[model samples]
Target: MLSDEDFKAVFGMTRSAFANLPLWKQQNLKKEKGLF
Candidate 1:
């Protein structure tokens, strides 16, 4: 469940930031329940 709503709302990071992160970092966020 790669969600965008909470990701932007909570992180205050641009969507571009999320898009540019390496594969591992994206997975890390998901694992920490940050991506979803």
Candidate 2:
């Protein structure tokens, strides 16, 4: 019930893995969330 879109690509710990990704990947994920 708490799953997210980018959460799937990172494998686990959505936010943690998201932070671990390259800044470029982070941008894409942010795009998914309309962060910018």
Candidate 3:
């Protein structure tokens, strides 16, 4: 989960703006999908 500050820095958007974005519905983009 992205912290509010990290999300803002990465996306250059405010917390509120990020919250208004479309739901994060895409499948995970990890190369190692099931390694824990």
Against the hidden reference, what TM-scores do the models get? 0.42, 0.40, 0.32
What does candidate 3 score on TM?
0.32
Taking all chains together, the TM-score of candidate 1 against the true structure is: 0.42
User: Which predicted model would earn the best lDDT?
Assistant: 1
Task: Residues 1-36, candidate 2: write the lDDT tens digits.
Answer: 225764555444576665788898777766665352
Q: Which stretches of candidate 2 lie over 4 Å from their true place?
A: 1-12, 34-36
Who is ahead in lDDT, 2 or 3?
Answer: 2
| RMSD (CA, Å), each prediction | 3.1, 5.3, 6.7
| Best-performing candidate as measured by TM-score | 1
Q: Kindly list the per-residue Cα lDDT of model 1 for residues 1-36, writing each as its tens digit.
A: 435676665445755586578888766765665644
Model 3, position 18: C-alpha lDDT score? 44
After best superposition, candidate 1 residue 14: deviation in angstroms? 3.7
Query: Sort by TM-score, best first: what order?
Result: 1, 2, 3
Distance from true position, residue 17, model 1, in Å? Answer: 3.2
How well does model 3 score by local distance difference test? Answer: 0.40
Specify the poorest-scoring 10-residue window by lDDT in model 3: 26-35
